[PDB]
Amino acid sequence: MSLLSKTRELNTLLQKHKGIAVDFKDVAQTISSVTVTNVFIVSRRGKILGSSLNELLKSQRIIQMLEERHIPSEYTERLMEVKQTESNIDIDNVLTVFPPENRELFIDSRTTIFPILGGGERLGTLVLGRVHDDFNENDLVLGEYAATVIGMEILREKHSEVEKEARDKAAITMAINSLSYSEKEAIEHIFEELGGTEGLLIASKVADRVGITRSVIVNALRKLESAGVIESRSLGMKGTFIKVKKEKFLDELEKS
What we know:
The protein is of the alpha+beta class. The protein has helices at residues 3-14, 24-35, 60-68, 73-79, 137-178, 181-194, 203-210, 214-226, 249-255; strands at 38-43, 48-52, 86-89, 110-118, 121-130, 198-201, 230-234, 240-244. A hairpin with a 5-residue loop joins strand 7 (230-234) and strand 8 (240-244).
């Protein structure tokens, strides 16, 4: 398979399509199969977002050892310190991604490390490994492109995650601030009865058993609904369905 053929595969298979969430496991398999390598996609903090081995090796002993090994966190955390592309790293190098014990099976291994950059910040690391062969200039071009694509998908993922967490934290703080002292106490009792974050509430009956008025319960939920912390729905002449939408709300509430 020629350089231009490999490029077509990666353009067609890695392209972001509307309606699809990025699956880093499947990204690693595409890279592994196109470039004939073992692939490890590592977040900036060292989490293995996705991996795939080149299972087309002749030696079942090598395959089984790679299948059995879990990349240590000590290694993945070192990758952040690699600031530029390091290619054709040998087995004696501390940056090798291959197992350290059986030096003779991996004596000819090469590791290549690509920093994944996005918006002027480190987003993660792409690590490629080969048991017997070198990374030539065509291989490095394909590796860099893969790293570029992954960075764009992480960047979109992180952008939306930071915005969501901020939206949730603002909603919780505004909900908690808008609650009176009695309304706060009622919410604590409400979720003490529901035994969780979701369930059916019979306000009148629960108000009776806790020594609180139905009006206080109703107003407290109304403020949480207005803040977007929960959703509420009456289920008939009695009963209200309650679901917390901000997971960290109750934890933050008790801190108030």
